[PDB]
Amino acid sequence: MTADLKSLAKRIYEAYLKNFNMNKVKARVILSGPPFVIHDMETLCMAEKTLVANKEAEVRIFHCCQCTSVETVTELTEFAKAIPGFANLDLNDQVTLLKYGVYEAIFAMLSSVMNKDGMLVAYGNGFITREFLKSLRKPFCDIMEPKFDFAMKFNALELDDSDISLFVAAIICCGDRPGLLNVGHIEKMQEGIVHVLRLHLQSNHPDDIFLFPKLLQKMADLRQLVTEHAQLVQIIKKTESDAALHPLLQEIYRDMY
Numbered sequence: 453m454t455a456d457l458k459s460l461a462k463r464i465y466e467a468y469l470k471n472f473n474m475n476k477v478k479a480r481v482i483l484s485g486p487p488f489v490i491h492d493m494e495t496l497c498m499a500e501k502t503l504v505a506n507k508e509a510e511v512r513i514f515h516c517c518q519c520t521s522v523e524t525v526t527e528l529t530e531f532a533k534a535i536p537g538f539a540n541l542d543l544n545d546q547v548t549l550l551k552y553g554v555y556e557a558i559f560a561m562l563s564s565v566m567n568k569d570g571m572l573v574a575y576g577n578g579f580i581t582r583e584f585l586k587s588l589r590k591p592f593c594d595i596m597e598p599k600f601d602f603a604m605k606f607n608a609l610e611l612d613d614s615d616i617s618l619f620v621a622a623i624i625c626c627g628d629r630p631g632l633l634n635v636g637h638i639e640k641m642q643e644g645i646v647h648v649l650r651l652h653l654q655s656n657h658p659d660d661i662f663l664f665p666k667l668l669q670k671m672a673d674l675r676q677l678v679t680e681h682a683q684l685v686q687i688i689k690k691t692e693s694d695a696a697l698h699p700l701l702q703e704i705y706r707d708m709y
């Protein structure tokens with residue numbers, strides 16, 4: 453890798469460590485063994501009563517997840533400035549790339565805090581079990597299990613934060629998002645990031661030279677995961693009278709898929 457490329461990879465990496473609340477190194481430290489375990493209705497309510505000393509438990513959970521989304525949206529917007537060319541793009545194209553990319557990035561990064569038994573929540577202070585989420589009443593029990601299925605395979609790739617930062621940058625740089633005005637410049641931006649991702653993976657993972665095509669397929673998987681998630685969110689929005697959607701997230705979903 454040329455010093456410029458090698459340096460650009462570090463640039464991306466440092467912006468990822470700087471802007472994102474959680475990262476894989478820290479998550480693994482906490483998960484290695486002290487997070488309060490949410491494994492049933494009793495422990496969920498105990499955990500809630502920590503913050504609010506009426507709505508169904510499923511709906512409370514539905515709204516906590518949204519707060520994590522809003523926060524990650526803000527962090528991703530700042531992260532994106534480190535991508536060579538992004539800040540030089542038309543303002544509307546920036547909005548378009550982030551609108552379509554944020555949820556793909558969200559589910560990619562949530563894998564870092566997930567293992568086969570559950571996931572870290574509430575800024576590392578809670579661990580909610582996979583089985584508890586499966587026990588929620590339909591259709592809320594169908595929200596997270598596809599995310600766990602994705603994460604277990606994604607985590608099997610054994611990426612580190614230096615790979616993931618580039619992967620997330622690559623996600624944001626997809627030149628085939630609908631409504632992009634300056635498609636040609638975005639494709640050049642994408643080609644540059646994917647170029648850095650490709651070379652970095654070869655350097656960082658000599659034991660798996662097929663990691664790059666595996667990750668391209670995970671990008672396609674994430675796109676389908678997001679489409680299906682948005683559909684389930686919409687169904688919960690229309691049915692379920694107590695389920696509200698944060699206005700920033702509504703605008704993300706609006707006219708998306």
Ligand SMILES: CCO[C@@H](Cc1ccc(OCCn2c(C)ccc2-c2ccc(SC)cc2)cc1)C(=O)O
Nearest residue numbers: 513514516517518519520521573574595596685701
């Ligand atoms: C259903 C909405 O899905 C979102 C996308 C989305 C899906 C799962 C998610 O897992 C966040 C972690 N988690 C789960 C899995 C249950 C409860 C929490 C939790 C507990 C306490 C806190 S304290 C702030 C924060 C979160 C995060 C974002 C969207 O569409 O925006």
